[PDB]
Structures are given as C-alpha cells and as structure tokens.
Design brief:
By secondary structure, the chain is an alpha+beta fold. The protein has one domain. The chain is 31% helix and 22% strand.
C-alpha cells in the first residue's frame, strides 16, 4: 500500500486542518443530506468545521491549491478536540469517554474524515468516544455520513497555504483504507495532483454539470515548494510531461509518484522561507513541529 509515492506502512502521517470558509455553505449540505434536531445553523456557527487532510509531504503545504476527496465513497462527520487530549485514567489506551451532551460542550471542532481514521483518531486523543455508561463496547458520535460528492466545490482554507480560496475537488483514486482519505492537492510538487487537475480542467464542462463547480474556481496557482538539481522547481509538472501521462488513472502513474517522492526526498531542496535551500528531510521535521506547536494539525499513525 502506497500514499503519495511512499510506503504507507512506515511513517507518521501529518494531519492538516482544512477549514470550511462559510458554515452556511456546509449547513446547506447538512440539511439536504439530513432528509436521506438541536444540530442547527446556530450549532455550526459556534464550531470550526474542519476536514482532516492527511499528508506525508507537509513541506509542500505552502503550495496547497485544492483539497481532494473521493466522490464515490462515504466520509464521516464528528466532533473532536482542537489539541490532542491524552486522558488515560482507568485504562492503558487513551479514552475520552463522554456523553452526547459532554461531547457537544467540550468539542469546538467539527471534523470530517474517513471511517478508517475514526477509531485511530479516538485512540490518539483527537476525538472523544460516546457513552451512556451502559455498554462496555465503544461508540462514536457521528453527526452525519455523506459521499465526497457532496463536499465537492466547498470553499476551504488552511492556515499554511499561500492562497486561502481552496476548493474541494474530486479524486477517484484516493484509497479509503489509508489515513483520513482527504489529501491536500499540491499540483506544483506532485505528479498525481497535477494530473488530476489537468483532467478536471480538460473537462471543465463535465465536472461543472456533475458537481457544484465553476470554470473560474479551477485555475488556482500552486506555489512550487521544491527544486531538483537540474530540473528546477515545478517537478509535478516536469515528470507528468516527461513520462507522457494522459490521465490521473494512467496505471503508469503509480511508479512515477514513487520515483518522484524519493527523488524529492534525497535530492530536492526547498524554495520557501524560512526553509530556503534546505533538504526535504530537515524541513519536513521543522514544518511538523510548526504544525503541532500552532495547533494546525496532528501526528497520526495507523
């Protein structure tokens, strides 16, 4: 199993907070998908609504121009904490067992993420577990369950990106059994991200009828965070062209990504301050320290 060209098995993921810009645009989606009580407009106004995006390349987050979900598959909406809460108590694992009401008080953030991640997130203290004190079995508080389709086109930002008008775009090759299954799009420094964007632009028309997207939302710049020795920056682009990729489904792409991930990791250098000219492995660590220190994300293992 691979993620962004690397073996998923081996590393910590970095989860980055991708904020919804307008809670009403999210609330609309909630009302429509309710059809298929105190969870009001007023509830979503008092909470930050966050997609937990997963990445093994947090050094490229400056270059985030979109955010990818799988449109065919289901995502889960829950309540969790702003910083990891490491209550142990009676148990050896982390467990913030709360009632429906206690959860609604203590959780300032509405998180959106894959089914795969939930129990992992709960055991790493990011979300509470639900209880009425009458079952030994675990439970989570799920506000809703929606297909990634429904999220597409939502205006979103991160606090690490250069630009703040990032949109949710559809990627069908996202794997629902790898971390949160929401991934930053960085089309400058990822061949897979560049290829997905090209397809979507190449079919402006199709994607705009099927989803809630507009032509004008589909041309955001992605600042290129990584240089290679003789290639220069914009490596996502350069390897897409040199390996004649025609589609983000091209079966050939899986190995391009792997070749790119490694070449960046050992031979690449950083293009942004305060990391200019640094090696990826040194910068990556600094960015994760920054992300954790400012509560813009979480460390995540599964």
């Amino acid at each position: 199993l691979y993620f962004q060209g690397a073996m998923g098995k081996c590393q910590e993921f970095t989860l980055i907070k991708i904020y919804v810009h307008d809670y009403k645009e999210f609330y609309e989606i909630y009302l429509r998908n309710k059809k298929l009580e105190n969870v009001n407009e007023n509830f979503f106004s008092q909470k930050k609504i966050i997609l937990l995006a997963s990445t093994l390349k947090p050094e490229t987050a400056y270059g985030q121009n979109y955010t990818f979900v799988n449109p065919g598959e289901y995502y889960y909406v829950t309540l969790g904490f702003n910083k990891q809460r490491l209550h142990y108590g009676d148990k050896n694992y982390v467990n913030n067992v709360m009632t429906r009401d206690e959860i609604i008080d203590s959780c300032e953030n509405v998180y959106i993420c894959s089914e795969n991640s939930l129990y992992n997130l709960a055991y790493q203290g990011v979300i509470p577990m639900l209880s009425k004190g009458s079952s030994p079995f675990s439970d989570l508080l799920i506000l809703m369950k929606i297909k990634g389709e429904e999220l597409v086109g939502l205006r979103t930002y991160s606090n690490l990106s250069e630009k703040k008008d990032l949109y949710i775009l559809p990627m069908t090759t996202i794997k629902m059994n790898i971390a949160t299954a929401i991934v930053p799009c960085v089309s400058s420094d990822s061949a897979d991200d560049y290829a997905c964007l090209q397809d979507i632009r190449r079919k402006q028309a199709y994607y705009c009828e099927k989803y809630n997207l507009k032509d004008e939302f589909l041309h955001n710049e992605s600042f290129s965070c990584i240089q290679l020795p003789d290639i220069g920056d914009n490596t996502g682009k350069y390897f897409y062209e040199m390996e004649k990729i025609s589609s983000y489904k091209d079966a050939k792409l899986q190995k391009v990504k792997e070749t790119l991930y490694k070449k960046q990791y050992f031979e690449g250098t950083m293009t942004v301050e305060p990391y200019k000219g640094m090696k990826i492995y040194n910068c990556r660590k600094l960015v994760k320290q920054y992300i954790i220190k400012n509560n813009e994300g979480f460390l995540y293992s599964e």
